[PDB]
Design a protein around this ligand. Structure first.
Ligand SMILES: NC(=O)c1ccc[n+]([C@@H]2O[C@H](COP(=O)([O-])OP(=O)(O)OC[C@H]3O[C@@H](n4cnc5c(N)ncnc54)[C@H](OP(=O)(O)O)[C@@H]3O)[C@@H](O)[C@H]2O)c1
Ligand SMILES: Nc1nc(=O)c2nc(CNc3ccc(C(=O)N[C@@H](CCC(=O)O)C(=O)O)cc3)cnc2[nH]1
Ligand SMILES: [Mn+2]
Ligand SMILES: [Mn+2]
Ligand SMILES: [Mn+2]
Length: 159
């Protein structure tokens, strides 16, 4: 099973200048809980944005060019990325925009954080057809001293 996980600001913005400009520790904790001990697939730009391997996860990087770091696994196509995960129950696709576009048609589950924040981004999450997805979990949180915007955790499953 393939799942996507992403945090979206207003208008489905997910990034700006290869960075995420907000800071929501509660959302990073949610990301860690939902990805630990699973393989994670990311594109090369997201690999450079994160800047180091994510511990406790098999890190698989999509790039058309040879890998430059043997602490992670480099693959050259979507099919190779999936095969490199092996026989696991759940593969987590962690972006970015181009990678989400390619894996969305194959995904059965979306783990989305909706952040109540406006930022002027250059990368968006794909337009997804709402009729195809059932919300199976949602949890709203007001802003607090650690998390400067309100946010909603949602899990959607393909109908
Ligand atoms: N808010 C969130 O949840 C979230 C999550 C992840 C990322 N982001 C943000 O998203 C942005 C990065 O997204 P992005 O769309 O620019 O880039 P991306 O999807 O991370 O990376 C794209 C790169 O991945 C490689 N790639 C993708 N598909 C491939 C394929 N089928 N075969 C081979 N290589 C493939 C290519 O690398 P080569 O050029 O080397 O071939 C391509 O240029 C950043 O701003 C980051 O902060 C946000
Ligand atoms: N909901 C969500 N939030 C995100 O921040 C996010 N980020 C990415 C890609 N970028 C990043 C950037 C940093 C870390 C990171 O530092 N993660 C640590 C934090 C652990 C914690 O804060 O408790 C990790 O071990 O996962 C992960 C992914 C993909 N999907 C996401 N999905
Ligand atoms: Mn092929
Ligand atoms: Mn198999
Ligand atoms: Mn806000």
């Amino acid at each position: 099973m393939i799942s996507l996980i992403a945090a979206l600001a207003v208008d489905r913005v997910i990034g700006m200048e290869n960075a995420m400009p907000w800071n929501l520790p509660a959302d990073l904790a949610w990301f860690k809980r939902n990805t630990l001990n699973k393989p994670v697939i990311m594109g090369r730009h997201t690999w450079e944005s994160i800047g180091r391997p994510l511990p406790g996860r098999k890190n698989i990087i999509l790039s058309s060019q040879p890998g430059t770091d043997d602490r992670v696994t480099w693959v050259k196509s979507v099919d190779e990325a999936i095969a490199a995960c092996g026989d696991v129950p759940e593969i987590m696709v962690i972006g970015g925009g181009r990678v989400y576009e390619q894996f969305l048609p194959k995904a059965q589950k979306l783990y989305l954080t909706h952040i109540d924040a406006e930022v002027e981004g250059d990368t968006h999450f794909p337009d997804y057809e709402p009729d195809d997805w059932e919300s199976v979990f949602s949890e709203f949180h007001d802003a607090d001293a650690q998390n400067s915007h309100s946010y909603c955790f949602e899990i959607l499953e393909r109908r």
